[PDB]
Amino acid sequence: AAPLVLVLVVAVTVRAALFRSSLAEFISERVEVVSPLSSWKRVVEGLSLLDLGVSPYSGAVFHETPLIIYLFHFLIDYAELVFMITDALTAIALYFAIQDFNKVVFKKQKLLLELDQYAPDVAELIRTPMEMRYIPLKVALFYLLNPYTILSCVAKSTCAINNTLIAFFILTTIKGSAFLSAIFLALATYQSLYPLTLFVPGLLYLLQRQYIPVKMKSKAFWIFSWEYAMMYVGSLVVIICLSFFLLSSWDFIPAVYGFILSVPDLTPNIGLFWYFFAEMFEHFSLFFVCVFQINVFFYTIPLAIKLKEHPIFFMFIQIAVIAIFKSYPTVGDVALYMAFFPVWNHLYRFLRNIFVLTCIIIVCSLLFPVLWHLWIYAGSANSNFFYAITLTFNVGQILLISDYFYAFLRREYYLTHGL
Amino acid sequence: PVRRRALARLVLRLNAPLCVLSYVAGIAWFLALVFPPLTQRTYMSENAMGSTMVEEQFAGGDRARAFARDFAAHRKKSGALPVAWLERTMRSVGLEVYTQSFSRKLPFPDETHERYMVSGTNVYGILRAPRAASTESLVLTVPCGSDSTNSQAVGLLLALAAHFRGQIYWAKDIVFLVTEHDLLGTEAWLEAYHDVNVTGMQSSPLQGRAGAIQAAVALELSSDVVTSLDVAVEGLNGQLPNLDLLNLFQTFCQKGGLLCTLQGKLQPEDWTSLDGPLQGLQTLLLMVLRQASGRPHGSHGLFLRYRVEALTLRGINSFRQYKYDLVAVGKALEGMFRKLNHLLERLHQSFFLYLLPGLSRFVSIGLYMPAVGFLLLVLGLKALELWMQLHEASLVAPLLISQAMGLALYVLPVLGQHVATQHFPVAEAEAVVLTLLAIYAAGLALPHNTHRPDRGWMALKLVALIYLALQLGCIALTNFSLGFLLATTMVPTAALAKPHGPRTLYAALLVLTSPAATLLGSLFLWRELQEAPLSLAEGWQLFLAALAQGVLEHHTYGALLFPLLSLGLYPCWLLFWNVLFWK
Amino acid sequence: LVCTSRFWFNYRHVANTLSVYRSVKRLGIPDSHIVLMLADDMACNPRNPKPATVFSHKNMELNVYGDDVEVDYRSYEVTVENFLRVLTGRIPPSTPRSKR
Amino acid sequence: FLQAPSGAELWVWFQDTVTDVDKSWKELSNVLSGIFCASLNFIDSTNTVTPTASFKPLGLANDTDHYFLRYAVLPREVVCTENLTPWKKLLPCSSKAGLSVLLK
Amino acid sequence: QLPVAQIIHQKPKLKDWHPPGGFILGLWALIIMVFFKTYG
Amino acid sequence: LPMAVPIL
Amino acid sequence: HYQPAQDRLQPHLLEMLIQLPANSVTKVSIQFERALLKWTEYTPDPNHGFYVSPSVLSALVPSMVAAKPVDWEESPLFNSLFPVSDGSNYFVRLYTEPLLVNLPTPDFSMPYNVICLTCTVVAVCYGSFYNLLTRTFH
Ligand SMILES: CCCCCC/C=C\C=C/CCCCCCCC(=O)O[C@H](COC(=O)CCCCCCCCCCCCCCC)COP(=O)(O)O[C@@H]1[C@H](OC(=O)CCCCCCCCCCCCCCC)[C@H](O)[C@@H](O)[C@H](O)[C@H]1O[C@H]1O[C@H](CO)[C@@H](O[C@H]2O[C@H](CO)[C@@H](O)[C@H](O)[C@@H]2OP(=O)(O)OCCN)[C@H](O)[C@H]1N
Ligand SMILES: C[C@@H]1CC[C@@]2(OC1)O[C@H]1[C@@H](O)[C@H]3[C@@H]4CC[C@H]5C[C@@H](O[C@@H]6O[C@H](CO)[C@H](O[C@@H]7O[C@H](CO)[C@@H](O)[C@H](O[C@@H]8OC[C@@H](O)[C@H](O)[C@H]8O)[C@H]7O[C@@H]7O[C@H](CO)[C@H](O)[C@H](O[C@@H]8O[C@H](CO)[C@@H](O)[C@H](O)[C@H]8O)[C@H]7O)[C@H](O)[C@H]6O)[C@H](O)C[C@]5(C)[C@H]4CC[C@]3(C)[C@H]1[C@@H]2C
Ligand SMILES: CCCCCCCCCCCCCCCCCC(=O)O[C@H](COC(=O)CCCCCCCCCCCCCCC)COP(=O)(O)OCC[N+](C)(C)C
Ligand SMILES: CCCCCCCC/C=C\CCCCCCCC(=O)OC[C@H](COP(=O)(O)OCCN)OC(=O)CCCCCCC/C=C\CCCCCCCC
Ligand SMILES: CCCCCCCCCCCCCCCCCC(=O)O[C@H](COC(=O)CCCCCCCCCCCCCCC)COP(=O)(O)OCCN
Ligand SMILES: CC(C)CCC[C@@H](C)[C@H]1CC[C@H]2[C@@H]3CC=C4C[C@@H](OC(=O)CCC(=O)O)CC[C@]4(C)[C@H]3CC[C@]12C
Ligand SMILES: CC(C)CCC[C@@H](C)[C@H]1CC[C@H]2[C@@H]3CC=C4C[C@@H](OC(=O)CCC(=O)O)CC[C@]4(C)[C@H]3CC[C@]12C
Ligand SMILES: CC(C)CCC[C@@H](C)[C@H]1CC[C@H]2[C@@H]3CC=C4C[C@@H](OC(=O)CCC(=O)O)CC[C@]4(C)[C@H]3CC[C@]12C
Ligand SMILES: CC(C)CCC[C@@H](C)[C@H]1CC[C@H]2[C@@H]3CC=C4C[C@@H](O)CC[C@]4(C)[C@H]3CC[C@]12C
Ligand SMILES: [Ca+2]
């Protein structure tokens, strides 16, 4: 109780201290922290264009949804308070979700014990109440005190609101409400397109909570799936139709979703698209954009075949994949799946090459600003340095995720067959 | 697998000799850079200047002399820069003349230059290219101090402007600039020109501009005749210009058969025997120390900030019998500017990161990076060994106390200089230095260890090693000389800290390689290379002067050495000190 | 007649093309039947010590740019593609007569 | 008396009977490029504007609807003797009489 | 050339932008309709 | 080559 | 009046009417950001820069002396270029100078290495996931 309040106080104090210093303007302009879809300056530009009588979507600078326009129209003066509130909200939601999940896990593990479906000598692999006591508080601390999250907050990037919506989706799903879950997933899909892939894991968790078997010759399964899908799609339809009536146009749609899907702007970031499409042969551009945006939606089905009985680990992997392979990535997207590492640290004995990967990620994080400076202000370097750093960062992320997946499977094998 | 569980054991069994081998390898590699395989010869590499030719026709020596004599007398009478005379004379030769006023407040009184609050004026004149618009410009500047020097430079500047005014073939504008105080006027002019408030200096707004600046040349000359010309290339924070500018200057030195020098040292025509390597090593070391300092060694150094290639030329009269007249220097400058006119793009095709064993020899980055890679390997091997033994809290207080001490070192000395003056009998300028020394010493006495195992100090050492390796590599990317010097002084002693063993020896080795002892050693080396030795008390005085200059230059020019040391490198060395004296 | 060089230090190629143009005009071919393509301007380059002149020898007794000259393709419209279009006749429909 | 920007500029007022102004504007630029030996074919939609209060007619006018006005500038166009030869070709005495003999 | 008053009056005056009222009504009706399910 | 060597 | 730009379609346009106070200087400023283009969209000399066209200024400047009405067929040709509306002012149109601006550039030499490297990274991810999802512990 007191630990959570103390953590919140420390996080708010650090953010408030950094808001008043001489580094806020420097932080607000980093290409690693803001994107053409997240910058605060584009928000104020759109609001000014509306007061000059021009449509915000008639140019090439503003790519935000109308709901952001409404919110910040009413709260432009109190901007710095909003982001603190949102970060606290996502931390608290994660805390309570993890508490409930741990209860389910211990109860499920306890039930198997008497059905004696575990090997005779498998102990020291059994979860105990003394070790799961401080997992939620840790999760909250890892989210709040991550430098990526603090940097995102001081820059007033819109990614914080997206993270809050995802965290509320997780909280409502684990607590067992499907209507609110569908609403929050629709709100997350409205802002960015990729969160639609989290539809399958949440449905699997809900079905498992109802004790409904998942089979092709079942009746409850199909009815539940149909109801959930209908609620989600209706939510999306109503939000879009409501968005039409703010400015009486459909122009926001190509400005947002077309921009995400087609990647016209070539500003550098920590992703894999910008330099590839600045150095492309025009004959193959369509084929390559199609391939590299199918890659994101590719893994959901086989992962759902393998991880059918473990929906939450499935969610964690899917969020990491979205963060790695999106068109305009930011460190704020990276922090969200890093917040989940404490949940999976009982798998530490089966991890291999964790040390080198952590060191490499840490080094690349510091090497981004120095090489940006040497390229853009000194003139002593070129874009190849920056491209190499982005390549190394993404490779390290992929290796780390694969390691966690391997450790999970190895522990399952040892649980079933004997240590 | 068992393959990579068979290598780790070998590394654990042979860690001790491998670190020694790699450290020796790095030192030997740095010592090998002056020998022919790594050292190349300089070449032009830009066809815009390599395929053309220039026929000089300057002839204004008497006019330059008379201008100098009239300028010196007027400055004597005024006691400062004669502004009306300069404007009238500049207008008489046919330029557009402008002025600028500037002022600032210094953090503390300066003993070296004797300034506290500085105000002055800059005068500049523009020559507009007749057959073009105002899109590009070249700068020729003469920095004036308060020491009654550089009158002949002003005379030569005015004569060159009078010669240049009557031609048709200029494709860029030319700015003729005379500044009030040596490097404060140049900084004020550049800040007003680009409309950026980098330092906080106040000024009147500029009324005349000439487009984007491409290159600049600074001239210093205090005699009618010269015996040699000396060139400077290093700038603020260890930034360098393009090598093609230096190649051009050297190409106009052989045409006029003038005695050119780099660092004040004359080089042989060819490496005739083994006597060449010694001089090459001397020149390389002088360049390394100068680049490590990070100071703007002339007006040209401040130009490197705005991506403008800048060159400084100093003429020396040194009792050698053969003398050169002013016409030769004028012809050399005319040729350089005429060849800079022929460029069609920005300079972008030679080298931007390099080292100079001589005026016509160079080494590129891909040849000298292994010298630092080898030492980073030592750090990595030791960290790997620590991780192994650790797998075979108590850290919060050391980390927080170390960073707090670093912040106190950064912030306190300049503030609280009036309270110390009031309470104790010391002058203002030395109070800052004494506060620096006092906080440095107070860092060593561990306060929390007054209050009254293996994993704790092993984890602390692992963290410290990773942190130091990060900083070392980042510093090397910014300035190679600084990173290499810090690595070669700090790697071996940080690799040996252990709470059990000969602790007195380890403490004596840790004290002598702190960031403060490095500076004293470097000062002694610099004096030894110059062939002017030093004693103990003279060295102590020079050390205090260097500390004051470092703080003042961080405040006035934006140098980064003081923040880097105080905020990043002092706490890490404190962490190693904590490791040695664990509890 | 085509010159495919660039910058100011490539003065020679432009000088050669101008000499050919002077000869063919002096011998009778009209300016509407000559398609002249020059990739850069050397006669009115701001670096030229003698504006509006191009010389063949250092005595400076023959100016090959001349008083009367007309160029169809300027510096940025000289390319392999346009030369091939002119030769093959596969030119954009709005192109004027003088440039085909 | 009169001033012009560096490079080349062109502004045109069309008649109100013109239906499609962009097509006619492109065709006119291509035609002028042949007469004056300039690269006016580089005028496209990325460097053409329709001013709303500037560049009003200089001759007899009845109504001023800026729907029929176009303007463009090419700031890197070079003016050399090749441009002056067609210019002098349009004069009636044609450099052989009067004030035209002074244009060298 | 340069008629000042006509130029000034050729454009309607600039008023600040405000969200339409129907959008506000729709938003809050939707939110409360959702709230009356989970609570009543 | 990387994609189709594992599959078919 | 402001018209925003569209990438590769149309430029920015800005048009203002400002009253200038007497014996003074007025400053107008606006911020911009530079863009990175495709490697095929640069000129043969890409390290020279791009040009912003000169700006136009139009005004009715006050006159020292009052001018009489004039007939264009009997006046010098340099006095009949602009129609005159009032005898106490006269019309002028001024142009400023062009500006040269630089952009960041990509590497024009390696459009083919980039494809190989990026596809290699994607293949690394694919291989890891396929090997983990298809096989079984033995
Ligand atoms: C850890 C696992 C890593 C996973 C994958 C690895 C990814 C990154 C790691 C390493 C790099 C591999 C990929 C790098 C490829 C591009 C980067 C590059 O090589 O460029 C160089 C960058 O420098 C660096 O890479 C290192 C600096 C810092 C980065 C550190 C690396 C990561 C560190 C992170 C962790 C460290 C510690 C952590 C542990 C705790 C810059 O050099 P430069 O630009 O001068 O050279 C280029 C270029 O060189 C190359 O790219 C090499 C070619 C192959 C490289 C790929 C590597 C193979 C395998 C790597 C193994 C890694 C491990 C994987 C297994 C797990 C190239 O050769 C030339 O083509 C290029 O152009 C050249 O640029 C210059 O060259 C020309 C000549 O000067 C010039 O061309 C112009 O001029 C010519 C005139 O002669 C003309 O003919 C041309 O037309 C041209 O046009 P021009 O007219 O001049 O117009 C000018 C207008 N501007 C170019 O201009 C010139 N730029
Ligand atoms: C141990 C730990 C691990 C990590 C680490 O240490 C710690 O490991 C270390 C180690 O691993 C290092 C690497 C080792 C290998 C290195 C290879 C090196 O490339 C080679 O570098 C050579 C340096 O002498 C040559 O390059 C010349 O470099 C000169 C400058 O030093 C130029 O001046 C010259 O070009 C000039 O061009 C104009 C003309 O005057 C001449 O041509 C020539 O003077 C270049 O040479 C030219 O380089 C070009 C580009 O490669 C062509 O190759 C060209 O080829 C010519 O082509 C002509 C046309 O057909 C032909 O006729 C002629 O015969 C050929 O010669 C060749 O002249 C050579 O060339 C080139 O390859 C690269 O820079 C850095 C490099 C990777 C290193 C980077 C840093 C490291 C990783 C270190 C790192 C810290
Ligand atoms: C612990 C060990 C540390 C070492 C770090 C790992 C380095 C591995 C990769 C090194 C080489 C990369 C691939 C080569 C491609 C370049 C091709 C090329 O020609 O790149 C050359 C090599 O230049 C480099 O990039 C130097 C290598 C720099 C690597 C970075 C090392 C610094 C440490 C950073 C890490 C900080 C913290 C780490 C410690 C924990 C550049 O060639 P040159 O400039 O002469 O000549 C070409 C210039 N020209 C004419 C075209 C204008
Ligand atoms: C310290 C390690 C890293 C930095 C490496 C330092 C470089 C080597 C030092 C000497 C080489 C310098 C050669 C060329 C520079 C100019 C030479 C010169 O004129 O003298 C050296 C010149 C001294 O000039 P003066 O004494 O004013 O002039 C006397 C007459 N000339 O030295 C310098 O100015 C070098 C810069 C000083 C370094 C200070 C930087 C940081 C300052 C605060 C330190 C931070 C806290 C750590 C210590 C605090 C407790 C002591
Ligand atoms: C300014 C931006 C850059 C800063 C970096 C900000 C974020 C980047 C870091 C992202 C984190 C990536 C991975 C971190 C951990 C992931 C896995 C993990 O947590 O594993 C733990 C262990 O992981 C590690 O810590 C291993 C990594 C190697 C040690 C790190 C040493 C380096 C510290 C930093 C030194 C230099 C700092 C310089 C400041 C930039 C398990 O702990 P446990 O559950 O207690 O297991 C024991 C069971 N009883
Ligand atoms: C579950 C849904 C999202 C379908 C599964 C994902 C993919 C099969 C589809 C869905 C949306 C598609 C994208 C929608 C829009 C575009 C923009 C389109 O851009 C253009 O045609 C413009 C010109 C060009 O850039 O080539 C290129 C394909 C792409 C990325 C498509 C690639 C294939 C995608 C990723
Ligand atoms: C930099 C690291 C290695 C820490 C210690 C080295 C330097 C910081 C300082 C510390 C002690 C100094 C030495 C102390 C005493 C002397 C004797 C001094 O000899 C004299 O000229 C004095 C008169 C005489 O003895 O004849 C020459 C410099 C030297 C070697 C000094 C050189 C620079 C040293 C090594
Ligand atoms: C971390 C940076 C500063 C690298 C510098 C390495 C240090 C070990 C340097 C700094 C000052 C140097 C000293 C400066 C002066 C001298 C005097 C010199 O004696 C002479 O005058 C030689 C002539 C003779 O008597 O034969 C012998 C080397 C020594 C001790 C030097 C040894 C190497 C020192 C200690
Ligand atoms: C505008 C923002 C704040 C969203 C507010 C909540 C939105 C998502 C609410 C308001 C009205 C809601 C809808 C009302 C009725 C239905 C019919 C039901 O059979 C499926 C769900 C569906 C289609 C709801 C989906 C969620 C919904 C669209
Ligand atoms: Ca013709």
Author numbering:
A (entry chain U): 2 to 420
B (entry chain G): 7 to 398, 425 to 484, 491 to 621
C (entry chain K): 49 to 148
D (entry chain T): 103 to 206
E (entry chain K): 348 to 387
F (entry chain S): 527 to 534
G (entry chain T): 415 to 552
Question: What did the published study say regarding this structure?
Answer:
Here, we report the cryo-electron microscopy (cryo-EM) structure of the human GPI-T at a global 2.53-Å resolution, revealing an equimolar heteropentameric assembly. The high-quality map sufficed ab initio model building, with a total of 2,393 residues (94.4% completion), 3 N-glycosylation sites, 4 disulfide bonds, and 22 lipid/detergent molecules. The overall GPI-T architecture assumes the shape of a canon (the luminal domain, mainly from PIGT/GPAA1/PIGS/PIGK) on a carriage (the transmembrane domain, TMD, mainly from GPAA1/PIGU) with an approximate dimension of 148 Å by 141 Å by 83 Å. Consistently, our structure reveals that PIGT and PIGU form a platform for complex assembly. The PIGK protease domain sits snugly in a three-sided cavity formed by the PIGT/PIGU platform as well as GPAA1 and PIGS approaching from opposite directions. In line with the multivalent nature of the interactions, disruption of the disulfide bond by PIGK C92A caused a significant (~40%), but not a complete loss of the apparent GPI-T activity. These interactions place PIGK at a “mid-air” position (relative to the membrane “ground”) with its catalytic dyad measuring ~22 Å from the membrane. Indeed, the protease domain of PIGK shares modest sequence homology (28.5% identity, 46.4% similarity) and high structural homology with legumains (Cα-RMSD of 2.3 Å), featuring a central 6-stranded β-sheet with 3 α-helices on either side. Combined with rational mutagenesis, the structure reveals an unexpected composite GPI-binding site within which a juxta-membrane portion of PIGT is found to contribute most to the interactions. Specifically, the acyl chains glue to the transmembrane region mostly of PIGU, and the head group forms hydrogen bonds with PIGT N461/D521/S523 and PIGU N383/N385. Interestingly, this composite cavity is additionally filled with a density that fits nicely for a digitonin molecule which also contains a polysaccharide chain like GPI.
Eukaryotic cells are coated with an abundance of glycosylphosphatidylinositol anchor proteins (GPI-APs) that play crucial roles in fertilization, neurogenesis, and immunity. The removal of a hydrophobic signal peptide and covalent attachment of GPI at the new carboxyl terminus are catalyzed by an endoplasmic reticulum membrane GPI transamidase complex (GPI-T) conserved among all eukaryotes. The committed step in GPI-AP biogenesis is catalyzed by the GPI transamidase (GPI-T), which cleaves the C-terminal signal peptide (CSP) of precursor protein and covalently links the EtNP moiety of the mature GPI (typically in the form of the GPI core with three EtNPs and three acyl chains) to the newly exposed carboxyl terminus of the so-called ω-residue. GPI-T consists of at least five subunits, namely PIGK/Gpi8p, PIGT/Gpi16p, PIGU/Gab1p, PIGS/Gpi17p, GPAA1/Gaa1p in human/yeast, respectively.
